[PDB]
Design a protein around this ligand. Structure first.
Ligand SMILES: [K+]
Ligand SMILES: [K+]
Ligand SMILES: [K+]
Ligand SMILES: [K+]
Ligand SMILES: [K+]
Ligand SMILES: [K+]
Lengths: 416, 631, 67
């Protein structure tokens, strides 16, 4: 888009004139002499006792012929394109273009260079070009809505951008306002501003004249009313955003309760061979409060992994790394009032895992016997009603068979 | 610099009174400012509760399956890239929707406003007066479909009242409510299209697959790396879509001015490979599919054709053409009565000429299980049918099931090939439904379902050509089809030779229709589907055996037919003309012919094209190809 | 006293490389410590979910009228 090229150029043009201010302050020596232009350049000095401050170093800045020429060219281009953008899109209104604080800053930085053309003696005059920060940051804010080149990162970059300039505006401001007193170098001023906005405040380099002291007070007040806006937007994005090793097994269930989980952990981890294993739980519901308390125990925090998802969704299967899983345990829900509906879910879940990871041994727990032949393909199938009633019947021939089978299917060392 | 905790030290207190004042003021600040901050936190906590060319998506509950099916189709067109989407759902955003809306691709495009279309403020927040289109979709998960339809009728009225000059795109569930939203620019009836597509599957197999692959905007790049031949040709030919172009300004057809429709349809297919299925005259608005050989082309006609790429986007084939440089097709051209059914069950039911009984059949004779005065037969064996049966396992018999019988009983269907229809309902049909179907020949019903083996054996499942399952059936969303899939699976094991046709809510469940877990080939297709999903293909379910054979289609394809209508306003009319849901005089119908060994002397599809359009004036769309794939 | 933002000023950098290191080190602290704080906030958020002669009141649902 040609409009994007215009905005990108404008942003590059604002950062260009900010740099050309730096090259001016780097190549300007006040010690050699300052003046309006040509006529009587004079040497100025600081007397601490003198309560009167010479404004000539502040008002006049010695600017080279080439540097002034390239500056006004960029400044005129700055005004031409801002006028182009203003005139291109009125949005059904003529007013309210000056009350928004982006056009007044463009005026203060741009028009004086236009005026300097009329007066050659006024070409070596100081203009707050360093304020072209806020247009450049604003231009970046407008552009960030267009294309990515990552949602919270854009705000973090903007916070860094407003931090980068809040130093930049201070440093050029503190250095120039110190051209009347202490003649601070750019690097020393930059070190002064960093320790100021970080609330360190060493005091080795401090303002010594009232214009320099006033700027620091204003700059601090600006920080206290600009940075919190960035922090609040950062808080919103963070709030809205709020909503390992090998040899793992997956435990695909419908609703995980504390009784079922511990019956698995006490049995799966009772074997020394299964100690390095970690457990992935794939339940479509939010984690039960009693499960969260157990999962925050140091023993189970690093082993049990709870993923909220469905076995029928491949992304949830991909998050669980089922293709690398050593086994999949598809357990059925007994608390459900519709057991046939529950059985149909574990049949689909068994098909979903077999379709996604065919070379993964399935371990299915089936409630009703009539649905057992759909999951006959599974490596190990247990039918709840088949075993429960056969155990009860055997209790009527051989008593306590349900106890004999129970103590045989529990891994214990017999120390009880 | 003191209250900002800077503390330079250039100006400091030098006497103990001034030092003491600083201490007590630091203490005062630490006990006064936090009081203000706490109040600000309270107010902030309590307070916590773009460009042009946008379209609004007014729904009742937005789910991730419906949203992605819209985004993949709406944004598949380069013309619709600068558009952003406004969603107006009265419920809180689903968690799975928020995760997608935080993706950088969809963050700046999809806008979710929680509100109602019946409130003008929410309509004002959505900027519907400036919207390019409004998509009022219906909720299929709701248990009361009549209540759901009444909501989308009011929503269509609310938008039409607020923004009259906004094209409405309504999705209606039940056919009886379709005439309230007839004012809308593009209306799709779910039950009308679903049952007509199922009925056509019993005449022309895999018509549901043919229609589905035509209403999905794809470039035909699926399965192009597959070692199998059937996956490369079927994955390429799936890129065909129905386009339109004026006859005079069409490099495909403009050279056939003054020639017959059959002449142009063949030669254009012979030369460039496009299939001219129908046209639309400038005088009328009606679109005629295969207007006939007697129709002479004109420079002002709009030609509807099927091709992989649009004429404007096919600059390569014309450029490739410049790199190189059977009778012939002529340049010019009980006894059942035939009549319209007496009782149309609803307004807007397109009158189709159907085979009818000479005398209205009594309600007693329309029943299989119970015998009556005219016949004491109790099952399909006692009736002694001469043809194979068609068993429809529906829940309730309404206007939707009526649209299943009309295509099967149309006058252009063969009288000797009329398949008896057995409606296996679990609820006793209302007298209104029986009044509609009492005139059709060989239409019966019986209480039961597909989960009961006894009812199906009495229905005549032993000698049934097809078994259509449409029965209705949760937080975990994909579990909606759990009952339907398993109940159909049981019959796939009991009757391996039976042809079962099913409808599923979610297309991702199509893999489960005929599940062979101990099958190497079928599970290998899962990996191929993953690659298409990685390649950003919306036709991922394409390569499943049941869907490709026409055994299953998802009604989510009707969602895509509505979103396509934003760019192809003819798509709804074209599809209905194929299904026969609207019978424009002079318009053709979708037929099917079987190639036996007696037709093998025709070597290729092009030669068969010439034979049909030179003698019978038929235009072939596609081929239903079957191979031997021993499992 | 520098990382605690006290900054007495009795011992300060006096050469530009030493000044530059302090400026960089402050910038490093402002971009490293918040990462630790954010992780601490996350863990604290997830974690959020006497004498003798006492009697126990076992009920199914406690209402203000009964209490
Ligand atoms: K033991
Ligand atoms: K295409
Ligand atoms: K297509
Ligand atoms: K401090
Ligand atoms: K300090
Ligand atoms: K200090």
């Amino acid at each position: 888009r040609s409009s994007l090229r215009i905005r990108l150029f404008n942003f590059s043009l604002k950062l260009l004139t900010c740099l050309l201010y730096i090259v001016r302050v780097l190549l300007d020596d006040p010690a050699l002499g300052i003046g309006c232009w040509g006529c009587p350049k004079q040497n100025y000095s600081f007397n601490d006792s003198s309560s009167e401050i010479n404004w000539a170093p502040i008002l006049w800045v010695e600017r080279k012929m080439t540097l002034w020429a390239i500056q006004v060219i960029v400044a005129i281009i700055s005004f031409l394109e801002t006028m182009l953008l203003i005139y291109l899109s009125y949005k059904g209104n003529i007013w309210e273009q000056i009350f928004r604080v982006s056009f007044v800053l463009e005026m203060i930085n741009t028009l004086p260079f236009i005026i300097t053309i009329f007066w050659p003696p006024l070409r070596n005059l100081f203009i707050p070009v360093f304020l072209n920060c806020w247009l450049a940051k604003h231009a970046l804010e407008n552009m960030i809505n267009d294309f990515h080149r990552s949602a919270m990162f854009n705000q973090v970059l903007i916070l860094f951008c407003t931090l980068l300039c809040l130093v930049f505006t201070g440093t050029c401001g503190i250095q120039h306002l110190e051209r009347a007193g202490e003649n601070l170098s750019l690097l020393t001023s930059f070190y002064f501003c960093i320790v100021t906005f970080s609330t360190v405040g060493y005091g080795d380099v401090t303002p010594k004249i009232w214009p320099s002291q006033l700027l620091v007070v204003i700059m601090i007040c600006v920080a206290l009313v600009v940075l919190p806006l960035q922090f609040e937007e950062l808080v919103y994005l963070w709030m809205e955003r709020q909503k390992q090793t090998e040899k793992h097994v997956v435990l695909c269930v419908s609703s995980l309760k504390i009784d079922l989980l511990m019956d698995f952990l006490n049995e799966f981890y009772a074997h020394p061979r299964l100690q390095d294993y970690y457990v992935v739980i794939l339940c479509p519901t939010e984690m039960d409060v009693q499960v969260r308390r157990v999962l925050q125990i140091p023993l189970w925090s690093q082993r049990v992994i709870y993923l909220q998802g469905s076995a029928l969704k491949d992304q949830d299967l991909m998050r669980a790394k089922m293709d690398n899983g050593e086994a999949c345990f598809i357990l059925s829900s007994r608390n459900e009032v519709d057991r046939t509906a529950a059985d149909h879910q574990t049949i689909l879940r068994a098909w979903a895992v077999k379709d996604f990871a065919p070379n993964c041994p399935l371990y299915v727990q089936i409630l009703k016997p009539e649905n057992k032949f759909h999951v006959k393909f599974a490596d190990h199938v247990v039918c709840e009603e088949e075993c429960k009633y056969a155990m009860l019947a055997l209790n009527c021939i051989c008593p306590a068979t349900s106890t004999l089978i129970t103590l045989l299917v529990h891994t214990s060392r017999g120390q009880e | 610099v003191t209250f900002s905790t800077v503390g330079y030290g250039d100006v400091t207190p030098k006497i103990w009174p001034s030092q003491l004042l600083v201490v007590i003021m630091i203490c005062v600040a630490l006990v006064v400012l936090p009081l203000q901050f706490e109040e600000l936190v309270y107010l902030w906590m309590e307070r916590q509760k773009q460009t042009e060319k946008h379209v609004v998506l007014c729904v009742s509950s937005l789910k991730i399956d419906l949203l992605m099916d819209f985004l993949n189709e709406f944004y598949a067109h380069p013309r619709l890239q600068d558009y952003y989407v406004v969603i107006l759902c009265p419920t809180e955003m689903d968690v799975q929707v928020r995760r997608v809306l935080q993706i950088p691709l969809w963050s700046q495009r999809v806008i979710y406003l929680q509100g109602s279309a019946l409130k003008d403020q929410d309509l004002m927040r959505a900027k519907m007066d400036n919207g390019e289109a409004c998509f009022i979709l219906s909720s299929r998960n709701e248990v009361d479909r009549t209540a759901a339809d009444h909501q989308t009728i009011l929503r269509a009225w609310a938008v039409k009242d607020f923004a009259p000059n906004c094209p409405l795109y309504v999705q209606i569930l039940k056919p009886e409510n379709k005439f309230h939203v007839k004012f809308a620019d593009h209306v799709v009836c779910e039950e009308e299209c679903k049952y007509a597509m199922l009925a056509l599957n019993c005449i022309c197999p895999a018509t549901s697959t043919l229609i589905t692959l035509l209403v999905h905007t794809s470039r035909g790049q699926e399965g192009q790396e597959s070692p199998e031949q059937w996956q490369r040709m079927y994955g390429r030919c799936s890129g065909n879509e129905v386009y339109h172009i004026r006859m005079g300004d069409s490099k495909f057809f403009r050279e056939y001015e003054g020639k017959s429709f059959t002449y142009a349809a063949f030669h254009a297919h012979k030369k460039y490979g496009v299939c001219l299925i129908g046209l639309k005259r400038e005088d009328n608005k009606s679109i005629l599919l295969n207007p006939g050989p007697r129709h002479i082309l004109a420079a002002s006609d709009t030609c509807f054709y099927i091709n992989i790429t649009k004429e404007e986007n096919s600059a390569f084939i014309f450029k490739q053409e410049e790199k190189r440089k059977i009778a012939p097709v002529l340049e010019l051209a009980v006894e059942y009565v035939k009549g319209y059914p007496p009782n149309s069950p609803y307004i807007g039911s397109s009158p189709t000429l159907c085979h009818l009984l000479p005398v209205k059949a009594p309600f007693c004779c329309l029943r299989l299980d119970k015998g009556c005065k005219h016949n004491s037969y109790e099952d399909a064996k006692a009736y002694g049918f001469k043809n194979k049966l068609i068993i429809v396992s529906a829940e309730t018999a309404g206007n939707g099931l009526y649209n299943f019988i009309v295509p099967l009983r149309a006058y252009y269907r063969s009288r000797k090939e009329l398949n008896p229809i057995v409606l296996l309902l679990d609820n006793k049909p209302d007298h209104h439904f029986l009044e509609a179907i009492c005139c059709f020949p060989m239409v019966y019903y019986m209480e039961g379902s597909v989960d009961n083996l006894d009812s199906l054996l009495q229905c005549g499942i032993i000698y049934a050509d097809n078994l259509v399952v449409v029965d209705k059936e949760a937080e975990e969303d994909y579990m909606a089809d759990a009952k339907t899939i398993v109940n159909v699976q049981t019959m796939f094991r009991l009757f391996p030779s039976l042809s079962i046709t099913t409808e599923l809510t979610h297309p991702s469940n199509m893999r489960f229709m005929q599940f062979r877990a101990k099958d190497s080939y079928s599970l290998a297709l899962s990996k191929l589907e993953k690659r298409e999903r990685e390649n950003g293909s919306n036709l991922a379910f394409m390569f499943r055996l049941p869907f490709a054979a026409g055994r299953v289609f998802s009604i989510s394809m009707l969602d895509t037919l509505l979103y396509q209508s934003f760019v192809k306003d003819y798509m709804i009319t074209i599809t209905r003309l194929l299904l026969g849901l609207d019978t424009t005089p002079g318009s053709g119908y979708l037929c099917a012919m079987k190639i036996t060994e007696g037709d093998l002397w025709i070597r290729t599809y092009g030669r068969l094209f010439q034979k049909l359009c030179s003698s019978s004036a038929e235009i072939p769309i596609g081929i239903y190809r079957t191979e031997s794939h021993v499992f």
